[PDB]
Amino acid sequence: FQVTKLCPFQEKIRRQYLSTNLVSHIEEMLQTAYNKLHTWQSRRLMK
């Protein structure tokens, strides 16, 4: 996910009129899946 999310970041910089209506639809559900993986990155307990 660290390298996949970087691909559209270097592509939407050439069309600012279209990139506005393309960041307010997928970010709401993507933050939930990323939050579940960010906790286990620093989790040091098996229970």
For another protein, the binding residues (CB under 8 A) are 21-22, 25-26, 28-29, 31-33, 47
Residue carrying the six token digits 């592509």 = 11
**Shortest gap between Cβ of 30 and another protein (angstroms)?**
8
Q: Which is nearer to another protein, 3 or 29 (CB)?
A: 29
Q: Which is nearer to another protein, 3 or 18 (CB)?
A: 18
Q: Which is nearer to another protein, 16 or 32 (CB)?
A: 32
User: Residue 12: helix, strand or coil by DSSP?
Assistant: coil
Cα dihedral 35, 28, 18, 6, rounded to 10, equals: 10
